[PDB]
Amino acid sequence: MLFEGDKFVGSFENAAAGTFVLDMYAYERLANSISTEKLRQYASTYNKYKYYSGSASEADYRLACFAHLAKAMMDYASNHNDTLYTPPTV
């Protein structure tokens, strides 16, 4: 799962569908669970998925979630501003 007490333990693919504060410790855990190549690939689809609202049942829902988290991660790496991550709003 996503937490083990007060500690964020989630992987990129699990966390992208969840809610957590993206701070440096969460970032470290996410970035070490996915390749830089795959992260860029998902991040490149953010413009497509930016205003996604399709339900969690939809088949493109991981893809939307992956885009959103990857963009959040690209942002943190540039600004280092801790921020709440929430999945594409359905």
- Report DSSP letters for the chain, one per residue: --BSSSSB---HHHHTTS-EEE-HHHHHHHHTTS-HHHHHHHHHTHHHHTT----TTSTTHHHHHHHHHHHHHHHHHHH---EEE-----
Specify if 90 maps to a domain: no
Specify if 66 maps to a domain: yes
Specify if 1 maps to a domain: no
The number of folded domains in the chain is 1
Structural domain span for residue 46: 12-85
Q: For residues 81 and 35, what is the distance between their CA atoms, to the nearest angstrom?
A: 22
Strand partners for 84: 21
Extract the tokens encoding 77.
């790496």
Specify if 6 maps to a domain: no
Specify if 58 maps to a domain: yes
Phi-psi region of 35 (alpha: psi -120 to 50; beta: other; left: phi over 0): beta
Extract the tokens encoding 53.
């609202």
Instruction: Output the domain CATH number for residue 44.
Output: 1.10.150.420
Q: What is the resolution of this structure in A?
A: 1.8
14 CB neighbour count, 10 Å cutoff: 13
Q: Which amino acid is at 77?
A: A
49 CB neighbour count, 10 Å cutoff: 20
**Which experimental approach was used here?**
X-ray
